[PDB]
C-alpha cells in the first residue's frame, strides 16, 4: 500500500493543527496545544488507490527536532499554510519555502499553498495575492476552513496528487 509523507508548515496560529485534526477526526478543535508537534496517520482512497497518509503537524519555530529533520528531508509533500486574516503569516510563506528548497536542494518540490480560515470576515490577504504567490512558485493555491471543513480534503488530496506528478 502506497504511503505519502506530508508535512504541514506555516506560522503559529494559522490552523495547521486544526486542519490536520479536521482531516483525521472530522471535528474542529478551538484550542490545541500550540507547542505539540506530532505525526498522524490516515488510510484513504484517492482516485481509486488505497493509500496511507503520514502527516506531520509542525509546531515550534526556529527549532530543529529529530522527528522534524527526518520528515523535513524525508517529507514528500508540503502544505504551506497561512491564514486569510493574518497578513504576517502570508508574508512569512516565502521563508518556509526557501527553507524547504534548501533541505530538498531543489525548487521543484511537491507543495500546495493553503489560505486558511476562509470562514472569517474581512480578510486581509486577497485570494488574488495568494494566487500570484503560488503562481510564482509554480504550485496550486487552495482556500480552506478547518472550522467548516471547506476545502480541507481538497488541500490534502491535491498535495497527494502533486506528489504523484513528481
Ligand atoms: N475561524 C477559524 N478559526 C480557525 C481555523 N483554523 C484554526 N482556527 C483557530 O485558530 C487558532 C489556532 O489554530 P491551530 O490549529 O492551533 O494553529 P497552528 O498553530 O497553526 O497549529 C485556534 O484558536 C483555532 O480554533 C479556521 O479555519 N477558522
Ligand atoms: Mg499546532
Ligand atoms: Mg503543476
Burial state string for 78-114 with b = 16 or more CB within 10 A and e = fewer than 16: bbbbbbbbbeebbebbeebbeebeeebeeeebbbbbb
Question: From CA 40, how far away is CA 45, in angstroms rounded?
Answer: 17
Burial state string for 23-42 with b = 16 or more CB within 10 A and e = fewer than 16: beeeebeeebeeeebebbee
DSSP string, 134-156: HHHHT--EEE--TTT-TTHHHHH
Domain count, the chain: 1
Method by which the coordinates were obtained:
X-ray
CATH number of the domain bearing residue 23: 3.40.50.300
Question: From CA 53, how far away is CA 1, in angstroms rounded?
Answer: 11
Query: Which residue has cell 500546495?
Result: 112
- CB 58 near ligand 1, within 6 Å: no
Cα(112) to centroid(ligand 3), Å: 10
Question: Which residue range forms the structural domain that includes residue 84?
Answer: 1-166
Q: For residue 85, what is its C-alpha cell?
A: 486574516
Amino acid at each position: 500500500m502506497t504511503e505519502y509523507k506530508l508535512v504541514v508548515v506555516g506560522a503559529g496560529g494559522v490552523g495547521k493543527s486544526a486542519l490536520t485534526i479536521q482531516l483525521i477526526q472530522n471535528h474542529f478543535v478551538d484550542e490545541y496545544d500550540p507547542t505539540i508537534e506530532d505525526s498522524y496517520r490516515k488510510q484513504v482512497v484517492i482516485d481509486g488507490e488505497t493509500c496511507l497518509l503520514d502527516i506531520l503537524d509542525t509546531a515550534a519555530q526556529e527549532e530543529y527536532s529529530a522527528m522534524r529533520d527526518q520528515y523535513m528531508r524525508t517529507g514528500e509533500g508540503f502544505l504551506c499554510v497561512f491564514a486569510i486574516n493574518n497578513t504576517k503569516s502570508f508574508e512569512d510563506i516565502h521563508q518556509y519555502r526557501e527553507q524547504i528548497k534548501r533541505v530538498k536542494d531543489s525548487d521543484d518540490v511537491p507543495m500546495v499553498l493553503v489560505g486558511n480560515k476562509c470562514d472569517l470576515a474581512a480578510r486581509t490577504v486577497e485570494s488574488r495575492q495568494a494566487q500570484d504567490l503560488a503562481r510564482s512558485y509554480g504550485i496550486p493555491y487552495i482556500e480552506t476552513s478547518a472550522k467548516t471543513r471547506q476545502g480541507v480534503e481538497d488541500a490534502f488530496y491535491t498535495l497527494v496528487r502533486e506528489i504523484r506528478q513528481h
